[PDB]
Design a protein. Structure first.
Lengths: 151, 52, 49
């Protein structure tokens, strides 16, 4: 794939994804991007939908194809494991869910992006992820678990 | 004082009866978290709507 | 003067029409604004489920 780290005094505190049409970057993190061609991106704030301005030209466009609605509950390619559910996130095991790795995409079997993680450092014996999802026709929904700290 | 006693003895037959039906509105639906409530009883007839 | 001038003794019918237009229309222009934020909140709430 193609995802970028955000530098803050030499350390990683977030991951910025790119989808065909608009780039993405979480609101709770800050720093400088690691690209010269992404250094001219007009940064702007938004609501909890996590909307950034994808002003990148045609040179690196069509990177990650968007996945539509009617998502099956089957296998999904998380970067540090796998997620198998549709309505909410599958209970990933312990160990994963640290800090500074926000915005990591959850891919599909065909390499298509379907959600972007936002928070949930720890819930207890399991770990629930607060991701953005598209409900029935493509309207973007921000879904959160009870008491999920940003991550 | 009779006017404020009839009101206060009939205002306590409200919450004894309205909250009795409001418990019966929702208890066949917190027993079923995998089924969606009808939209008539979601807001109008019973107070509490669907959450997440 | 035989009479006693009051506070509203000078306002004509045409001058009170401009009072009601300048009050009624601009107050209702905030009611349209206030009803707009209570509608898209309901739309985004219905997108949650």
């Amino acid at each position: 794939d193609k995802t970028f780290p955000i530098m803050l005094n030499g350390q990683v505190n977030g991951y910025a994804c790119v989808v065909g049409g608009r780039v993405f970057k979480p609101l709770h993190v800050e720093g400088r991007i690691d690209n010269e061609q992404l250094a001219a991106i007009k940064l702007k704030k938004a609501s909890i939908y996590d909307l950034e301005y994808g002003d990148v030209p045609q040179c690196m466009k069509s990177d990650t194809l968007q996945y539509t609605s009617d998502k099956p509950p089957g296998f999904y390619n998380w970067h540090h494991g796998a997620v198998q559910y549709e309505n909410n996130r599958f209970t990933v095991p312990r160990g994963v869910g640290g800090k500074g790795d926000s915005g990591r995409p959850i891919l599909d079997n065909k390499g298509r992006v379907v959600a972007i993680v936002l928070g949930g450092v720890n819930e207890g014996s399991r770990t629930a992820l607060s991701v953005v999802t598209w409900n029935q026709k493509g309207v973007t929904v921000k879904d959160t678990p009870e008491g999920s700290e940003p991550w | 004082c009779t006017c404020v006693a009839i009101i206060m003895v009939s205002c306590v037959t409200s919450v004894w009866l309205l909250c009795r039906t409001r418990n019966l509105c929702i208890t066949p639906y917190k027993l079923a978290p995998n089924a969606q409530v009808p939209i008539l009883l979601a807001l109008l007839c019973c107070i509490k709507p669907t959450r997440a | 003067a035989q009479h006693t001038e009051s506070f509203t003794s000078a306002i004509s019918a045409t001058a009170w029409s401009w009072i009601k237009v300048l009050v009624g229309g601009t107050s209702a222009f905030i009611v349209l604004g206030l009803i707009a934020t209570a509608v898209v909140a309901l739309v985004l709430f219905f997108h949650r489920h």
